[model samples]
Target: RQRFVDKNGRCNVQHERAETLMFSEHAVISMRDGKLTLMFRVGNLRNSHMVSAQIRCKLLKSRQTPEGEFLPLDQLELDVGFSTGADQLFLVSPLTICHVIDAKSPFYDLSQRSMQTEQFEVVVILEGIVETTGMTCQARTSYTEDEVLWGHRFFPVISLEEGFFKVDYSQFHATFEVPTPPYSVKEQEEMLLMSSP
Candidate 1:
């Protein structure tokens, strides 16, 4: 019989050795149920391993106040256990994190065109611990106006059902055509009346 042993003849089956995984982190801002929202898709591009991840969300804005300085409005933090079982981050098995831009949210007032002449940034920082390789990894990214979709929702991908074999993996990326905001006739008339003179 053979048993697992560690350095210095330490017989232990709980030995851990994890390496930094090849993964990517990205986010998208859109409207969900009449409220602004931030949605992140954390995917594992490489092989699956035990990973514990932390997410920090921050909102920054530049306002023309007394001194006109950029300030941090609000921030949020979250964490998740190591990826395993069905909750793991695998290929085509992305984990979604959502933040609603509500009253307490710093980006509650940030509109699609509001940051045209100014600056409003939604920054997301990710930190993870690779349990298999005993490594700490981190990644950072930001969201701007161009990345904000007016109104979008997470829709399911089409799955094909063969006789014996079935495709279970779902696609990660998808696009939606956001419907423009509706305009009232009164506002349209007022705008037209004010012009053409």
Candidate 2:
């Protein structure tokens, strides 16, 4: 959190641009499969000026090496999208970022099982500028295995009336019922047959 106020104590001076960020966990999450997609929402906490932001993310291998080196191992270029502008994000406005995790993804090896037992960290970094000032602002946050809900989809906005859109931020982190993959059952039975006591 890079929060600062000028010595002038001027209301005109823009201090903090980014206010609150929702990891979709504090809000909600969506992952298509073991290798899936992650969506999160971030909001500008500023009251006066609109904030512009640039986002980058990486899935870090949360375990320590015998040599004690910790760096992001997944270097695949991320295909990220914002609900707002192309490269820039807005303040007092929330931006949603979508990242796809696949076989080549750092998350390819990370799963609910690994997170619960081994633990993996998903780190997201954000860089922004206050519209009023040329100053730069940055934000960083992370989510571990236990924090993420697998095989879950966020609730869709189905209720919106004329000139009004009623959205449930409370349910932002809410996940709905989704059917278990058929393969999961098949996998269990196959393992059961292979087991000999």
Candidate 3:
């Protein structure tokens, strides 16, 4: 959307920022429900909040297969809230978006070690409508290998107390460590075989 500027050509930067979605400074990687998952946080900057907010994730990389197929800038759509429709979010509180790295996931084979060495990028896009102006807007952010935190989980920003709900934005970008397997899916599978007597 074109920005509104005065005759002096001074644009309203603060207004633009308020209308846009804000993403967490860092993305997280950790375990969820016994599976490795990638996560990021999103929050609305306005009190009115956005409506019909939708999220999408894409993983980009260049690869050469063992069969000699070279794929450049290969793009794979990562599932954020697959089958649950959780990707469509209520933006009242900051929400953590998740991508479970299961057998069908693109990151199924990515391990802690390979994650550091791989040259890949994760791009996240959020689309919604401004409740006041009824204008559709989208915000985007990206994460590289260095920008992701391993074995970390986001701090809970929502809590209920005294019959009221509160969202503490001070902890929005905070994370804590959790125990996560360092191995990939195939490696974990092998370890399971050895552990099963």
Candidate 4:
């Protein structure tokens, strides 16, 4: 009979090896019970090593201070263990609704001669499977846009109750009033003059 020997020249039936896996971005979003729910269906695979996952949710204030400073509205963090069962789902904690007001940044230059432009930005961070060794995978998403023509500020309003997680890999969604640009009086006059023809 043939026999397998281990490093010590001992017969062993089980063997161990290290392996790594990568996944693409996938996620889903929906509104339920006046809350925003996001679902992530992170795929799974057969491997010798174990896996873990984590997610970070944030509601960024879209307004800049009159002095051109950025501000943060809210932020949340969640984590889940590896699911061996057929259903691979992670539910995040309940989120709450919040409103933010921001003024335009004083540092913004509206002069046509200056190439500088001003705008607001939102950032999201996602980290998957933290192990004693290090991070397995990670991803990020953000929103940024220029201010409207009106001095009026635009803020993103999010209802935690309306937020939820779906059965997708990695995804993102946001709720808030859409920003609208205001036209200066001079610009409006130019339009009227041009249209007078």
Candidate 5:
């Protein structure tokens, strides 16, 4: 894995800004079924600048000919909303899985080019609440260079069935600047209650 660092010896914000927030990829190989399952988790936090955010997933198929020429077979797109709130945002469902497969498989070549396809999915979980009015709350977004690729053995793919994924609140923590004049205990309690699942 490659990491970018700033001149001050810290992670380079410029590089971070160009990539995804957090991503995890794993491969599940089944010897018995000759089937391979690739699992991926991509988390993006919109930079605190934008009040509203959008996350997109795309699947691509790659094909190589006997002559060693590579080409794209198909592509699929999925979009999700990244909004700040305690409520959950369900991005991928069984129905959406079908759409991804149908859209990504037409160009697949099982015999040539070591044919492989990439499946993309992203989950946006709000870690904090934004108090600003007339503006949407934005979270820092994360991405990896690999996710931007379209070639075989380089790109990632998702499964149509058993994609099974979830995001838990505890997995994320938010830190906000507390206003100097704090509210009363009753008001604080109410805010806490409202934010609680």
Candidate 6:
């Protein structure tokens, strides 16, 4: 019988090899549950799992503050369900990281029109330990203003089988167009305030 061996002739079956981690090439900006949101997918290319995976996002742009401070490439942290500890993940399968573009969000003022004219970058980072080796690893990706798709949403890749759950990675990068409000969250709020009695 043949057995798996490592460089030192030790059994390797109990341990996992280093593998590639990945993120979606383009992030999608769309509406979910009547709220503006930005999302991207993450997955491990191999069967190895990532434990205690934490994700973070940052918005980088140039801006002059009201106080007359010209800050180039200002960085703002984006909430990926962070307040509730939802930014942490067990990466057994692909997961979509979401950032709500709400009132407090740095992207709250971004709209379809402004996005075309704005120069910004959304940088994402993921860090975790390899399940079997206890080795720490990190992955990163970024989305420029034009790289974020508007009026689009990710396709459902999860489903239930007879007795287990299945994920169809073939559809992982799939997305389709959907209707969404053209105004930014800030504009929407202003419109609502004016219409209310």
TM-score of each: 0.52, 0.56, 0.81, 0.26, 0.25, 0.83
For residues 1-197, write the lDDT of model 3, one tens digit per residue.
33333467543322143533378888888888777788999987564456459899999989888999999988988999857999887665578888987777788888888876888889998888777888788888898878888888999887655544566777878889988878887678778899996
Tens digits of lDDT, candidate 4, 131-171: 34554756455433332212221122212222222222122
Per-residue C-alpha lDDT of model 1 across residues 16-98, encoded as one tens digit per residue: 22322222223445555654456755543243333456666565554545676544552333222222232233222345566
Ranking of all predicted structures according to lDDT, beginning with the best and ending with the worst: 6, 3, 2, 1, 4, 5
Q: Give the least accurate 10-residue stretch of model 3, judged by summed lDDT.
A: 11-20
Question: Measured by TM-score, how close is model 3 to the native structure?
Answer: 0.81
**Consecutive 10-residue window with the lowest summed lDDT within model 6:** 11-20
- How well does model 3 score by local distance difference test? 0.78
Q: What's the lDDT for residue 2 in model 4?
A: 30
| Ranking according to TM-score, highest score first | 6, 3, 2, 1, 4, 5
Quote the positional error of residue 49 for candidate 2 in Å. Answer: 5.5
lDDT of 5 by residue, 51-145 (tens): 22333444444547688987665443322222232133332211111111111233121211122333332323233332234354444332233
lDDT of 5: 0.30
Off by over 4 Å in 1: 1-27, 30-35, 45-50, 65-92, 115-118, 155-170, 178-197
Query: Where does candidate 3 clash, by residue pair?
Result: none
Off by over 4 Å in 5: 1-20, 25-38, 46-54, 59-197
lDDT of 6 at 141: 80
Task: TM-score winner between 4 and 6, please give it.
Answer: 6
lDDT for every model?
0.47, 0.51, 0.78, 0.31, 0.30, 0.79
